[PDB]
Design an enzyme around this catalytic site. Structure first.
Site, mmCIF file in Angstrom:
data_model
loop_
_atom_site.group_PDB
_atom_site.id
_atom_site.type_symbol
_atom_site.label_atom_id
_atom_site.label_comp_id
_atom_site.label_asym_id
_atom_site.label_seq_id
_atom_site.Cartn_x
_atom_site.Cartn_y
_atom_site.Cartn_z
ATOM 1 N N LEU A 75 -29.197 -40.841 24.357
ATOM 2 C CA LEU A 75 -28.292 -40.285 25.354
ATOM 3 C C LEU A 75 -28.454 -38.783 25.526
ATOM 4 C CD1 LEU A 75 -25.043 -42.243 24.404
ATOM 5 C CD2 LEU A 75 -26.720 -42.807 26.180
ATOM 6 N N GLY A 76 -28.935 -38.091 24.505
ATOM 7 C CA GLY A 76 -29.085 -36.656 24.601
ATOM 8 C C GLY A 76 -29.730 -36.107 23.348
ATOM 9 N N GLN A 116 -29.391 -29.078 19.597
ATOM 10 C CA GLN A 116 -29.962 -28.144 18.631
ATOM 11 C C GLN A 116 -30.140 -28.797 17.266
ATOM 12 O OE1 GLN A 116 -26.864 -24.869 19.646
ATOM 13 N NE2 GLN A 116 -28.716 -23.714 19.114
ATOM 14 N N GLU A 131 -29.459 -35.562 17.714
ATOM 15 C CA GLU A 131 -29.493 -36.341 18.941
ATOM 16 C C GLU A 131 -28.285 -37.268 18.971
ATOM 17 O OE1 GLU A 131 -32.254 -36.602 16.640
ATOM 18 O OE2 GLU A 131 -32.869 -34.669 17.482
ATOM 19 N N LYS A 146 -24.546 -40.248 16.430
ATOM 20 C CA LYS A 146 -25.105 -38.905 16.364
ATOM 21 C C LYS A 146 -25.994 -38.819 15.128
ATOM 22 C CE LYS A 146 -23.339 -35.190 18.020
ATOM 23 N NZ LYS A 146 -22.452 -34.039 18.361
ATOM 24 N N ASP A 177 -15.458 -25.473 17.732
ATOM 25 C CA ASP A 177 -16.465 -25.428 18.805
ATOM 26 C C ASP A 177 -15.941 -26.174 20.031
ATOM 27 O OD1 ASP A 177 -18.782 -25.009 20.292
ATOM 28 O OD2 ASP A 177 -19.960 -26.521 19.225
HETATM 29 C C1 LIG Z 1 -27.329 -30.567 25.360
HETATM 30 C C2 LIG Z 1 -27.041 -32.054 25.156
HETATM 31 O O1 LIG Z 1 -26.656 -32.635 26.371
HETATM 32 C C3 LIG Z 1 -27.311 -33.837 26.653
HETATM 33 O O2 LIG Z 1 -28.365 -34.053 26.154
HETATM 34 C C4 LIG Z 1 -26.698 -34.863 27.607
HETATM 35 C C5 LIG Z 1 -27.047 -34.427 29.032
HETATM 36 C C6 LIG Z 1 -26.770 -35.559 30.018
HETATM 37 C C7 LIG Z 1 -26.737 -35.003 31.441
HETATM 38 C C8 LIG Z 1 -27.862 -36.621 29.898
HETATM 39 N N1 LIG Z 1 -25.250 -34.945 27.456
HETATM 40 C C9 LIG Z 1 -24.831 -35.420 26.141
HETATM 41 C C10 LIG Z 1 -23.314 -35.225 26.049
HETATM 42 C C11 LIG Z 1 -22.676 -35.892 24.828
HETATM 43 C C12 LIG Z 1 -23.005 -37.385 24.766
HETATM 44 N N2 LIG Z 1 -22.248 -38.021 23.672
HETATM 45 C C13 LIG Z 1 -22.086 -37.409 22.620
HETATM 46 C C14 LIG Z 1 -21.316 -38.239 21.817
HETATM 47 C C15 LIG Z 1 -20.877 -37.937 20.382
HETATM 48 C C16 LIG Z 1 -20.287 -36.730 20.019
HETATM 49 C C17 LIG Z 1 -19.922 -36.486 18.697
HETATM 50 C C18 LIG Z 1 -20.146 -37.442 17.720
HETATM 51 O O3 LIG Z 1 -19.852 -37.253 16.355
HETATM 52 C C19 LIG Z 1 -18.634 -36.706 15.946
HETATM 53 C C20 LIG Z 1 -18.657 -35.807 14.888
HETATM 54 C C21 LIG Z 1 -17.477 -35.255 14.416
HETATM 55 C C22 LIG Z 1 -16.273 -35.602 14.998
HETATM 56 C C23 LIG Z 1 -16.249 -36.511 16.046
HETATM 57 C C24 LIG Z 1 -17.426 -37.073 16.519
HETATM 58 C C25 LIG Z 1 -20.768 -38.626 18.075
HETATM 59 C C26 LIG Z 1 -21.129 -38.875 19.392
HETATM 60 C C27 LIG Z 1 -21.088 -39.459 22.634
HETATM 61 C C28 LIG Z 1 -20.459 -40.667 22.572
HETATM 62 N N3 LIG Z 1 -19.735 -41.059 21.381
HETATM 63 N N4 LIG Z 1 -20.497 -41.497 23.605
HETATM 64 C C29 LIG Z 1 -21.171 -41.101 24.705
HETATM 65 N N5 LIG Z 1 -21.830 -39.948 24.910
HETATM 66 C C30 LIG Z 1 -21.758 -39.162 23.846
HETATM 67 C C31 LIG Z 1 -24.526 -37.511 24.685
HETATM 68 C C32 LIG Z 1 -25.186 -36.899 25.933
#
Ligand SMILES: CCOC(=O)[C@H](CC(C)C)N[C@H]1CC[C@H](n2cc(-c3ccc(Oc4ccccc4)cc3)c3c(N)ncnc32)CC1
Length: 447
Positions: A189-190, A193, A196, A211, A302
């Site tokens: 999905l992304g 830094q 992923e 993640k 953050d």
């Molecule tokens: C610069 C990056 O930008 C990109 O690549 C893309 C660009 C688009 C236009 C393709 N956007 C990104 C935006 C974010 C997205 N993302 C991130 C998480 C997530 C967050 C935290 C986590 O862990 C946690 C840790 C601690 C506490 C809580 C959760 C677990 C999952 C997540 C999810 N659960 N479901 C769907 N999308 C999800 C992925 C794509």
């Protein structure tokens, strides 16, 4: 004995699960987390059941119009969701009167547009309920059937219960630290830094997000200590942590959010068309999540639109709360560039490393500006040194077009240079929750 009845129903996923379809009754020995020890009468089968798919036999929780455990604000959001009609309604537990009830009804008028009106359902001393003294009822079902036949003083005649989907299955018991092989990563999905994010399947039968942190970015013991606090931060406006893989590369398993980050969403064809009242509702949802974090004496560290996720039904959920704390500073992570973004960070956090709930409040003000500008970079036309030096001289981002002045006033309060002068998230939550319903009564004083 404690007898229960199934509200929805779903079949087996895990070891020795039960298979009801919609309506059925049973008895439960005792509770174990959210998977209760279930005993069935007309099935002869023994196993476990999702606790959120059942309810007490003669309780209101069996009724299609009763919404247990939701707030007034979430009642309004649920009813105003697309798919509900004029007079859509729910009965819920009262927020301002313990043990009493509230009726929420979807209304419409050309002046105010789509609204939700709330009514106090008072209990009678010797049994029964009423909204107006001239019309008393023995049961809440009788109240509903009465107002389904005519408004009788309500804003609308009741039509159908508020729509609702089957809730998420509770996470598998004894599945906090899971093996890496239980996950199939299906779609990236992304990329970021320090890791992923993947869409993945857990044990062949559950969709999740994963993640995947880069090697060298965190240590297992420090992360696990923190993750054990994160998992307890359970709130509808925080993303749910399901599980972790406690071996490098560390994986973090959460619920999957179909519309990605709020930044992605605001910059998408669909999100860029959200009207200003919906933008303010997004702001309120995040403020509610942060007021919870504040109440739990936690720090996000953050907060930014990139760290807010959006569900398929447009629910905002705070992500990455506390995560920056356990990202290590070493030769590996240093190659990846800036750890925190200057334009979002409170001055005392930049200058002294003082991260508090008050530096989150500062960041929340920046996030409000991201929202009302549909994802524009903070401080357009300015470099990072220029921002720092301008802030030191009382510069703040000017109010953009299509930004209500009161929303900008909230931003300006978030951006006090002295952290103690910044408001609480409890305060921000109240102002944003009641943004448009100011100069209005909380309940309808029906004659
Ligand atoms: C610069 C990056 O930008 C990109 O690549 C893309 C660009 C688009 C236009 C393709 N956007 C990104 C935006 C974010 C997205 N993302 C991130 C998480 C997530 C967050 C935290 C986590 O862990 C946690 C840790 C601690 C506490 C809580 C959760 C677990 C999952 C997540 C999810 N659960 N479901 C769907 N999308 C999800 C992925 C794509």
């Amino acid at each position: 004995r404690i007898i229960v009845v199934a509200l929805y129903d779903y079949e087996a996923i895990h070891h020795e699960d039960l298979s009801f379809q919609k309506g059925d009754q049973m008895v439960v020995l005792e509770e174990s987390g959210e998977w209760w020890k279930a005993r069935s009468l007309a099935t002869r089968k023994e196993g476990y059941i999702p606790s959120n798919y059942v309810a007490r036999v003669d309780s209101l929780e069996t009724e299609e119009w009763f919404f247990k455990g939701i707030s007034r604000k979430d009642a309004e959001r649920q009813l105003l969701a697309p798919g509900n009609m004029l007079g859509s309604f729910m009965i819920r537990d009262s927020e301002t009167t313990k043990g009493s009830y509230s009726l929420s009804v979807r209304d419409y008028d050309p002046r105010q547009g789509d609204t939700v009106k709330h009514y106090k359902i008072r209990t009678l001393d010797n049994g029964g309920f009423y909204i107006s003294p001239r019309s008393t009822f023995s049961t809440l079902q009788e109240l509903v059937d009465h107002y389904k036949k005519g408004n009788d003083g309500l804003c609308q005649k009741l039509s159908v219960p508020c729509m609702s989907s089957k809730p998420q299955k509770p996470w598998e018991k004894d599945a906090w630290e899971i093996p890496r092989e239980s996950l199939k990563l299906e779609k990236k999905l992304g990329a970021g830094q320090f890791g992923e994010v993947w869409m993945a399947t857990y044990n062949k039968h559950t969709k999740v997000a994963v993640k995947t942190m880069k090697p060298g970015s965190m240590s297992v013991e420090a992360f696990l200590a923190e993750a054990n606090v994160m998992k307890t931060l359970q709130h509808d406006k925080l993303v749910k942590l399901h599980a972790v893989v406690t071996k490098e590369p560390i994986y973090i398993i959460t619920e999957f959010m179909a519309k990605g980050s709020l930044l992605d969403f605001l910059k998408s064809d669909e999100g860029s068309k959200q009207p200003l009242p919906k933008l303010i509702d997004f702001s309120a949802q995040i403020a509610e999540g942060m007021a919870f974090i504040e109440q739990r004496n936690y720090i996000h560290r953050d907060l930014r639109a990139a760290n807010i996720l959006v569900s398929a039904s447009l629910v905002c959920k705070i992500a990455d709360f506390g995560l920056a704390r356990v990202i290590e500073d070493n030769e590996y992570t240093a190659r990846e560039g800036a750890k925190f973004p200057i334009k979002w960070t409170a001055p005392e956090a930049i200058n002294f490393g003082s991260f508090t709930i008050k530096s989150d409040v500062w960041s929340f003000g920046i996030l409000l500006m991201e929202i009302v500008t549909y994802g524009r970079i903070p401080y357009p036309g300015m470099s990072n040194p220029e921002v720092i030096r301008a802030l030191e001289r009382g510069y703040r981002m000017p109010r953009p077009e299509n930004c209500p002045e009161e929303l900008y006033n909230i931003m300006m309060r978030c951006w006090k240079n002295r952290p103690e002068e910044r408001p609480t998230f409890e305060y921000i939550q109240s102002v944003l929750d009641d943004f448009y319903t100011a100069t209005e009564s909380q309940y309808e004083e029906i004659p």
